Structure formats: C-alpha cells, structure tokens
Amino acid sequence: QITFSYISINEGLSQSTVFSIDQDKRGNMWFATYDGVNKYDGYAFTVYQHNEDDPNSIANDISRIVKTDSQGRVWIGTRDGLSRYDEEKDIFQNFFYEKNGKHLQVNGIEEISPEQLLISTPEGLIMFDIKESKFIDDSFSTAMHKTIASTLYRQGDQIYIGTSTDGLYTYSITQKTFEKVITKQIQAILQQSPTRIWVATEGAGLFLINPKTKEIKNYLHSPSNPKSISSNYIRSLAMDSQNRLWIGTFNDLNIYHEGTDSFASYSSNPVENGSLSQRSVRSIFMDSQGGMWLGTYFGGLNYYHPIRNRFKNIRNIPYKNSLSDNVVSCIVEDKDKNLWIGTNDGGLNLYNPITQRFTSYTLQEDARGIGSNNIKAVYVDEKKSLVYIGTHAGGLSILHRNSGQVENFNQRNSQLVNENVYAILPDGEGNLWLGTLSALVRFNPEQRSFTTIEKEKDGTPVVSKQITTLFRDSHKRLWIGGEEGLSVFKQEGLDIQKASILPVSNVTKLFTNCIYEASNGIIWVGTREGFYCFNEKDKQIKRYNTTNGLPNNVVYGILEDSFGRLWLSTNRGISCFNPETEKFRNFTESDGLQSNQFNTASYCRTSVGQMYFGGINGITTFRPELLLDNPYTPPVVITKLQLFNKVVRPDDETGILTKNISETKSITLKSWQTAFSIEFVVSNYISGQHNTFAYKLEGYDKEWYYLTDSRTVSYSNLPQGTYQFLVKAANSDGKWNPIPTALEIIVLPI
Amino acid sequence: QITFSYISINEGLSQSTVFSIDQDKRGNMWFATYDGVNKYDGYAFTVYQHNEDDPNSIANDISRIVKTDSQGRVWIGTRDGLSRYDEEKDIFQNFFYEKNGKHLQVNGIEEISPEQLLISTPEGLIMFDIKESKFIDDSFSTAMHKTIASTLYRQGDQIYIGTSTDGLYTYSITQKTFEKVITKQIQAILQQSPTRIWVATEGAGLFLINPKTKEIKNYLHSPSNPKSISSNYIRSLAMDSQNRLWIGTFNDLNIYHEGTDSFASYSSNPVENGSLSQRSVRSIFMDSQGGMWLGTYFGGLNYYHPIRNRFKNIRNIPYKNSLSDNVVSCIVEDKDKNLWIGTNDGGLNLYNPITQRFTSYTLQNIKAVYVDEKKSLVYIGTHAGGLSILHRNSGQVENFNQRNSQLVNENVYAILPDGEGNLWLGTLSALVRFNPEQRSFTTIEKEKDGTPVVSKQITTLFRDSHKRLWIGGEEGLSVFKQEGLDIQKASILPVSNVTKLFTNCIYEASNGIIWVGTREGFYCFNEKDKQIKRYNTTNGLPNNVVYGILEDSFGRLWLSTNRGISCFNPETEKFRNFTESDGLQSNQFNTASYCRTSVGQMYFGGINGITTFRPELLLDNPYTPPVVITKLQLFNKVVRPDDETGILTKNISETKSITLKSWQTAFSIEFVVSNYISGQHNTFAYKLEGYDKEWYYLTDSRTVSYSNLPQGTYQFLVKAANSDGKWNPIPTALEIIVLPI
Ligand SMILES: CC(=O)N[C@@H]1[C@@H](O)[C@@H](O[C@@H]2OC(C(=O)O)=C[C@H](O)[C@H]2O)[C@@H](COS(=O)(=O)O)O[C@H]1O
Ligand SMILES: CC(=O)N[C@@H]1[C@@H](O)[C@H](O[C@@H]2OC(C(=O)O)=C[C@H](O)[C@H]2O)[C@@H](COS(=O)(=O)O)O[C@H]1O
C-alpha cells in the first residue's frame, strides 16, 4: 500500500513538468521545469528565471537537465546552453556553445573529473573545462564527437551513453576508449549490480543486461497481462532505500518484484485519494532521507516515505458506496466490531472496516424514516438487537436491526419534553438516560414512557439546563455535562442524588464537551476553554490550556492509547498529551488530517486499539502504536539575512556579506547598522514543515529560545563586542541535532 | 445562476461557525465565531482570542453576536458578557454583568442612543450606559426586564424584540412603551417596507406582517413542493442591492420571488462547483459594495458578487456525463455550434453547449482536430498514434501510423487544409501532405525551386487572409506561399532572432495585424511597414509562455499563459491579468487550448479543465476604496498606542503625524485596501515626500521599509488601484518627522 503527497503550482512550483531531479550538498532539492528552475529547502520555493536586464539570472526558463557533481556544484541544462548555480555568490554563471549561428541546447550533463564535464547537444558531444570555464570540442574522437546522446550515466570508471538510434555505448575515463554494447531512443540507464544493468527506452521497453555474459532480456507491455509493465515508453529509473527498482513510464508507475518477475502498476486515480497525481512519470529521485520523488509532466511532484504514511482519511464520494456526509458526529463500535457513524446532514451510517461497505439511514416521507438526518447520539442494545438514535430536531429513534423499521418520538406525538437528543446512556436498571437541550429524560423501553427529571433523591430542584454529554465511571456514578457545566450523581434506584466529590472550582461551570475515565483511574474532562484532570485520591484538579502547549482550547474528545498517552481533537488539529511529562505532540491538516477543525462527540477507540476522529471534512483514522518515528535530524541552514528588513546580498553596498549567508562564518556590523533579522531552514522532508528550532545569541541571550511556528530571529541596538549565534534542529518527533549551526556576529563601537 | 466564493479555516478563519456578520467604518468585515472573533480587511484575517495574561484581549472565545453602531463602534457578545473593540487603542474593553455568582452571556446587542445599548441575556433584558461603562438593570419596566429576548431589531425609533416563547414585542425609544405586536422562537426580524415585515422563526416557518392592517401570512415548507421554503427553522434575513430578500435556514438558502410568490432553493452541492459550502445558513450580511456574505455553521463563509461572477468552469465529474480528462488540448467548433474538445488522457470529447451532453472516444492523447463539414468527416491528430479519420454517420475510426502506412511520424500536432483538397500534417519530424482520395502520405523535403526543407518539429499551422501558410515549432517560425502542390519560402518577416523562437500559436486580428505567441513572450507583425514589437513580462504580461490568442468585439486580445489569462489592449499597450483566484480552472494553461465561437464566447483549456466566459458581458469593478495603514513597526517591533516608544498615542490608522527620535531609525509601514470585489488583486502606489525621487508600485507586498533617514519632515502617501486598474485619486497621508542626531 503506497500513497503520495502532492507538490504543484499551488505549493509554489513554477511549472508542472519536472524533467530532472537532484539534491545538493546543503540538502536542498532541485527541479528542472519547462518554465523555470525550482529550489526547495523543505519550507519554501526559490524559483530562478531568466532576466533580460540581469545577467546574474539563469540563461533561459526552459531547463531540461540538472546534475550535481562530487564537489556539490549544481549544473543546469537550458535551451540557451549551460548554467551553473554559484551558491557562494547566489548567482548563475551562464555558458554558451554557438555553432552554425545559434547556441546549442544542453540535454545531459555528466562528470568526468572535478575539473571536467561531459555535455550532450542535439549536434553531438562536447567537454566543458570547469577550471577554464570554456568548452572543448576538439577532445573526442570523430566517431564519438558527432554522436547524438539522449542520456548520460556514470558508474565508477565508465560512463554509459544512450543514443537516439545507435543503441548503447560505453566510455572509460582511464583508457579513453569508446565502444558499443549492442533501434529506439534510450532515456535512462541504471546499474543494480555488476551483473545487472537496466535500460529505459522510448517504446522499445525495458532491457536487463549482464555485461559479464553479454546476455540481454527484453520486457514489453501486453494489454492482456496487468502483471507486465504499463507502457513501453520509459524515461526514468531509480533505486529506493529498500533496494528495489522504480520504473517511471509514459503511463503509470512500475515496480519490479524479484521473486515473481512481475511488475506492480500504480496508476493516476481520481477516486482513491493519495494516489499518483498524473499518469506520465518523467523523473524519479531518492534523497538522503530515502524519500522517493516523482516528477510528472502535468501533475507536478509526488513524495513518498514509509514514515510519513501515518493517517488514513474517510470522506464522502458522490455516486459511490461511501460516507453520506463529511460533517461527522458520534462514532460507536458494536459487538460485531462495525461502526455506527453519525452525520450532520447525511443521516446515520453503518460501516464495515473490512468490507468497506456503507449502510445509510435517512428521513423518509412515511416507516423507515429516522425523524431527522442530524444524528448526535447512538446506543446499541446488543441483547435486544436494537439501536437507539438521538437526533437534533427529531427526537428519539429506535431501529430494529432485523427488519429495518424505525420508531420515532417527538414533542408532538409523545410525552418527550425536547426533540434534541444529544446523549444516550443506559441507567443500569433497564431504562435509558436522554441528554436533551432543556432537561434530562428517563425512557422506559418496556413502557414507551418519558420521565422528565426535576428532582434529586431528596427533592432538590434540578435546574432546567442543556445536556450534551453523559458518562458512567467504574464506580457506577453518573456524570452530566453541558454549557452550564459538569455535575456528579449517584443512583439510588430511579432517584439520583448529587454526590459532591469535585472541589469547588469555576471549571465545574464551564462548557463541558466530553468525559473520559483513564486506565489509571484519573478522570479527564475536555471543555471549550481547555481540559483538566480529576484525581479523586487527593481531590485535585490540574488545568491545561493553549499556553501549556495545547493547539486549541476547544477539546471535543479524549482517547487513551496503549502507552497511557492521551489523544485530543480540537479546532486546530489533534494533540498527543503525556500526563507524566505534561508535554504535547501536535498534528495538523498538513500532516494528513481530515481538517484542523474536528466535531463534537466525534471520538472512538476500537476494542482492537484503532482510533477514529471525525470532523467537518470526514474522519481521520490511525493506529497510535503503529506510528513511525523520524530518525533524521538535518543541520540548520541559514537561508536569509535582512538588514533593516532589506535583504543582505553578497557583494552588496552594505558590504557585510561577500559570500552567501550559508557560506559565511562571521559577520561584522558597523555603527549605523543596528537592526537585522535572520531566517533559517531545516531540510527535513519526512517531518516536512513541522520542526522545532532552538536559538541563542552567545554573549547577549541569557538562556536558549525555542521556535515552533517561526524561522526568523530579529535583533536591534546591540552593545559592542563579539557574539555568536547558535541554532539547533528538532524534528516533528522531537529528536534533536546535537551540533548546532554557528555564525559569529561582531558589533563595532558607537 | 448564483455561485459563491469560499472563505474558511484554510483561508485564515479561526472557526467554521459564523453566528453573526457586520462591517466597520474602515470597511473591515467582522465575524462572530464559536471560537474567537475574526477581523477581515480583504487580504488577511486578524484573529482575536482570549488571553489570561493579557486583560486587553476579548473576554471569551465563544462569541454570539457582533454589532456596529452609529459612530462605528464594534460590540461583541461573549459567554462572559459584553466586549467592545477600542479602535483608537487597538484593545478590548471587557464588561461583565454578574447575577447569582455567574457572569451573564450577551445574546443580542442593539443601539438605543450613541450612549445607550439594549442588551439581551439568558435571564432578561438589561441596559448598558456607554459613557459610564456600567449596566443599568432597574431601568426597564418589570414586564420588559424579565423578558428573555432571542433577537433584537431596531427600525428608526422602535426596537422590535423577538422572544423564545412569548412572541414579538415593540419598544419605542421616544414613548418608552412596551407592547406586543401580534408561539415559537424568533431568530431574525427584518422590515422591507412600512407594510412589510418578515419574521424568521425556529420551526414555525416564515411570517409576513403588515402592522398597519395587523394581518399576518404564514409560510411553511412542503416536501412535495420544491417551490416552497427549504426548512421551517429559519435564522437569518437580509436584503440585497437588487431589492431581493435572502432567507437563510437550517437547510439550504431561500430567495423570495415577488411575482410568483415562490422561493428559489440553493443547496449544498458537492457535484456542482461554486455552490453553497454548507446546508445551514446562520447569518447573511451585505457589504458597502453590495456583495452578499453568508455565514454557515460548518462550511465557513460564502461570498457572492455579480461583478466577481465572471467565469464558468467545466471539469471532469466521475460517474457522470462530463469531460473525460481535465488536461485539455485543442478545441474546435463545427457548423452545428457543437464543440470538439481534445484531451491528453481521456481521448476526444464532443460537447453540446445547449444540451450539456458529452461524447467520449477511447482507444479500447489528442492534439489536432479538423472538421470536414462537406463529407461529414472528422480528422484527428494524436501523439504516439498518428492520424485518425472518423465517419460521423457510422462511428468507424480509420487510424494510420508509421508501421502500417507510409506516414513518417506518429506524432501529429496540427491539421490544416491545403486548399487543393488535401491536408497538411504537422509532426515532430517533418511536414506531411495527405491525399484523402488516395490514402497516401507525402513527406515534404524540397521547395518549389528545390531548396531542401530542414527536418524540424512542427507544432502549429496557420492560414491568413492572403492565403499564406505559417509553420511554427521549437526551431522557429516560417512563412510559405503555395504554387500548386509545391511551396516557396516567402520571407516577408524582417531579419530577427524572434523567428528562431519556440512558437505556439499564430492569429490574424480583424485589423490585419499578425500576432504570434511564443514561449518567450509574444509579438505583433505589421506587414504595412514590416515592423515587429515584442511584449513580455516586463511589459505587464503575467508569464512569457503564451498558449493561445483570441480577439473580442472591442479589439482587445486574450492570452493564456502559465500564470492565468491576460487581456491586452494594443492601442494603450495595457494589461488586464486574471488568476486562478479570480475563478479560472488553474493558473497553468495548455497548448492549442483556445477557441472563439461564431457567437463570441471564448474557451480556454488548461491542466485542470476549461474556463468559459463572455468578454463583452464582463462587468468592471467601480469601487476604489481608500488605503488604510494597518500596522507600524520599529526594528521589527510593532508600535502600539501608548507604548514605551511613545511614538503612537492613537492607532496608526488614527494618527496623522509621527515624530521619530534620534535612535529610532528603522521602521516598516503596512497598509491595506478593502476591495471585496477585486479581492487580493490590487495595486498600491507609495512615495515618501522629501525623500523618494519617484512613485513606486506594489502588487505582491503591502510593507514598506525605510532606514537611517536624514532629519526633517516627510510625508508618506499611498494610493489604491483595483484589479481593473481604476485609481483612488485621493491618497492616504502620514507625516513623519525625523529629529536631528
Ligand atoms: C523528450 C521526450 O522524450 N519527449 C518529448 C515529449 O515532450 C513529446 O511529446 C509530449 O509527451 C508528453 C509526456 O508525457 O512526456 C506530454 C505531451 O502531451 C507531449 O507533447 C514531444 C513534444 O514536445 S513538446 O515540445 O512539449 O510539444 O517531444 C519529445 O521530444
Ligand atoms: C441557537 C439556536 O437557534 N439553536 C441552537 C443550535 O445552534 C445548537 O445545535 C446546533 O445547531 C446547528 C445549526 O445548523 O444551527 C448545527 C449543529 O449540528 C447543532 O448541534 C443547539 C446545541 O448547541 S451546541 O452547538 O451543541 O452547543 O442549541 C440550539 O438552541
């Protein structure tokens, strides 16, 4: 099971077609597009395009190839010619090879030595001297010089050359020999082992070559066999961290299996979300983290890493057997391990986690009508094979599972006092507690009667208030909560008496959403203004709000995993809370959730251990025990320095930088230079944009300082002296980079 | 046809539920959400939530109502009480009425005088004395004091009070009288005329009240009748600029029609795009521009303005009679007014503009389409396939390639008739002539005299009014004349490097000027004098890669690029750009994806569908609001009213002149314009008087930074231009005094 992330125009990409992908010594990703050259550092895009007035820009917007050498230098192949990105000066060095009047296009770049480069043109092959910054055309033999090369690939000593019609050739650097290997055009060359070389071709298919025996094996497409490759037109080959072949074709993605000798086809699917963005793959690259990048012709980019595969989403698909409405309320698991999902505008859904099937119930024009399509509460009478439904603006609905008939109760037909049932819980005696917007109602199922509660077990007037949630603890006590607040009760038969066990606090008068009893006996209550715990042993309440590390105050539901940690649904994502450390691990929509905003009663933990959180745009389901840790902690790269908000450039009038800010070890600031803001980045693609930075200015700052949403640090009016800036990198999972990034700052007298 | 714009969580809004909407003097929109109070100016949200460590933050996040009064003071109702946003100090003044140990919630706010407010609580009705910041509870008569009010609505002198169970009341400010007008909960009250009053109720439907006759008419929902209202549970009532009533209910939106006495139901539709975000409409408000704002319980906000309603998008709908693939190539209209639409991965599509019927052809990547109307044949050019002939009357397809026929290349990109009876075929290698009567392919290699034809990739073919052939591709462009079956190079273009550029399209304008679209901009050719003028991104073009050119009725041109559509006026050389946010299929468009019907309708395809519009039917935005200076920093530290810097005592928008001391050298000035029609597509013009030599223009940013200025008095000035390019003649002024050092 493999799903992709999407990076396209809306993400900051210049043009959808990604011809070539590479990574530099800094860790930044490089993408060659039909319109521009894109640099991605894990947070922001840096689009490089041609300027007619500025010579420092790239030669042309149409780039076709990108290759990084041994030294870490980035080389681009444009229509106008060759261009190198100078990191030190943050500029482009444009080179042109003019023949017969026009400058020739660069199709492929390959390294011969740290001082030499192999360049392929639509007219032949030429060598570029790096040290002399000039092209040499009188270096190759006549047969080699006029060879039209479509692809270039190096393996240690030998560089393999794929041509348009002449098949395959090889070139030794030491011996300087040009020999054939032995109709169509070659697009990609990749070697698995000294006995296995894979060759991608235009319509000729795939070829496995054993150069030791010179034996060849062809792979073609047949429409009858789905186990074969999808298309004969292939243009990209890559190896993953798990030592597997990745095949990018004109149609779909192919992955070779060693044992079965077959291929797995991964297609562009609009229905099943998470699938490939476009059908035509053109470039595949593995970063240092191991994450696979797929460059398509129209769909932008596709990222995949096993660790980032964390959350699964369940949404409505029109004209398909799927969820009815995206606005999800209560989720209840029965004895059959099925889920009774409630919705706001779609009715009641019955979902089988194995069979993927959905069974809906809606309002009918009079017998299978459920009163209202706005479900809030669900209870399963497993012994009687009945389901009790609580709907907003409808009342109580009783479903007979073995016939499908529905009994409806409201204010006009029955003695029910309120048509808005929000919570259903068994009394233990046989009846049911009904949490409505005005009062609490007891329902006798054997008598079909509604009893409004107005008195305690001593005749203490029960305030007519809003009831949204009901909970029964291990000590068989009833918990009643709503907007008015929380309350605790005992049950002396049918009568209820308030057992005041909570200490006097204004939190008992808070908008109550949910109550959960943890495995350690501690009671946890989630309200609209944070959440808290209740330890009855000593009678204490510890409150937890946003300034404690919580993403949002409005907590809709709490769930406990195998490790004792608590999972919370808010208006701004899901939070993982460890009561011992009192720390938070937060997840947002960008991490893979249905939406940052979640909904009331939309929390469910299965008997197996799976968690289900519903919101406004569907349900997010995951296994907290199965979630993978990110082991990668990349160094911090300082991307930008601004003086008085204006960006400091190398060799600019300020004269602070002559090298790039990334290259700079120390900066000297003159008397008139008082304000500056430093922006930094971390190249973590698994964690993505969820990273913690620790900064400190040695000599000025007393302690370290932490950043979770920001990346820029501003300082002003510093005293004279020599200071040091340090910055550490924590990933999403909380692992640190021990050795920080250091840039010295020298403040001159005033 | 009514379509909405979407504003929600991803747009910057704090929480999806919008209970009430209002607007302030400055033009900022105010939204009361279940979590926080949202302030929107047209560019960014300012979210106000509670802080336990700051007493100048809104008392509670749970906001129920927002109300702006006579003087433009913003009042919020929270679960803790009543809060006012002080504009002059950019703070929040929180007030709490305490009864029985608990602070009471404010459910509704109404203005009595510029010094008095009627406040409704879940326990009765109290008053708030503005000038004295105190609640007065012994002010009203015992009957009025204990009245649980659900909605408040003032009409001139009278304030109409809708209760939860006890019906409707009216309170005159002059006579201090409190009497019932004439069973369920009233949620909204609105007066259309002195004879027409609309009442929204919770489950009791809708009521039309004529107070002069005391006659009442009830409107209820009938499930069998789709003409009636959607639901009985109603909560919002608003009138638009065209004098129409907008009714927001628990289910769907209703719009009253005067003549038929019926209602138009607008539902939440996942299939049809542009529709309502969520079924339940909570609040409806009309801005100063006339645009309608709709607050939903779960979907956020829905904006509608007829002027902004420019584009209709046609996309692929799975399991539905629609477009096959969203990546669209060439589009051709036949004599039957129908559209032959080519796709990259869905084959070929036939579309009826009136019937909405789609017809898809699969293999069981189209790039060229030509219609033979006389023989009822359709010629198809495909990539990695060749040439395909379709008989419209049988449905049989005859396809040709390199392996079966004498065709040299399987990648046909352009088809154009030769005039004799044959067809020109533009392929990635050479040009081929195809005889339809003989079924033979002839590769062109020599000219009329015998000049060798270079093997280059051909992408486009064009015929002008003078019957000349135009050949364009990656190698460049070339002009030819026909001497029978032979062709001669007629070099009418002057010697220029523009001839050797990646060509995409050629179009002859009605005036006779030839327009060529390249990947490096576009240019015109006037044969009358043989002069070429180039236009690129520095001239005002959104992107250099031009895919298609079309002319409208006025003489303007419409161009598709990688960054939207541009409207070019050759007379003034001015550009009018459009992006995805304006309502396009996508910013990126595709090659050959341009079509103008005989009617005048334009069609542009891209990577995410097709966008259709009528350039003559497009409305201009006539609003040019003043610039409001949002924020001021000092060394990237935000300057606050009455702060330690001492620069601001009023708000930055309130302040007309500031004085900067010797050690206060660096600052940044943020500004905004509230144009909800133009959205985020605006142009700012700034200049500092006495320092800047000229005016400078901004389109992306709104922040201007200065540093180390000399001593003396300077004047900052800023103007506002809408998406259409209309200017605000009067600039916003802020005086800056720099002290000697
Ligand atoms: C470089 C290569 O192998 N093929 C070039 C490719 O662009 C050709 O056709 C395009 O193929 C694809 C694709 O998925 O790769 C998409 C387009 O639909 C199709 O045009 C042709 C055409 O190139 S063009 O300049 O984009 O028109 O050229 C091949 O060399
Ligand atoms: C104030 C009013 O007229 N009705 C209150 C409802 O807003 C609350 O229920 C929600 O109503 C709606 C809606 O479309 O307006 C959607 C949502 O699904 C319902 O739960 C109701 C309970 O309040 S709460 O939101 O649960 O806190 O109280 C009604 O009085």
Side-chain angles (χ1 to χ4, degrees), chain A residues 34 187 202 235 250 280 282 297, chain B residues 344 365 383 413 502:
Chain A
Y34 221 131
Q187 302 286 73
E202 281 287 303
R235 49 273 308 268
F250 187 78
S280 181
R282 291 219 65 155
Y297 203 97
Chain B
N344 193 68
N365 203 317
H383 183 82
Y413 281 161
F502 207 126

Side-chain angles (χ1 to χ4, degrees), chain A residues 344 374 376 392 422 437 466 468 511 528, chain B residues 34 185 187 202 235 250 280 282 297-298:
Chain A
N344 197 67
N374 200 315
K376 293 291 179 178
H392 181 85
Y422 274 72
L437 295 186
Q466 179 172 305
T468 56
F511 204 130
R528 292 224 172 218
Chain B
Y34 222 144
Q185 183 161 324
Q187 296 290 145
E202 190 80 6
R235 40 212 54 178
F250 186 86
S280 184
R282 262 287 157 121
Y297 203 96
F298 290 114

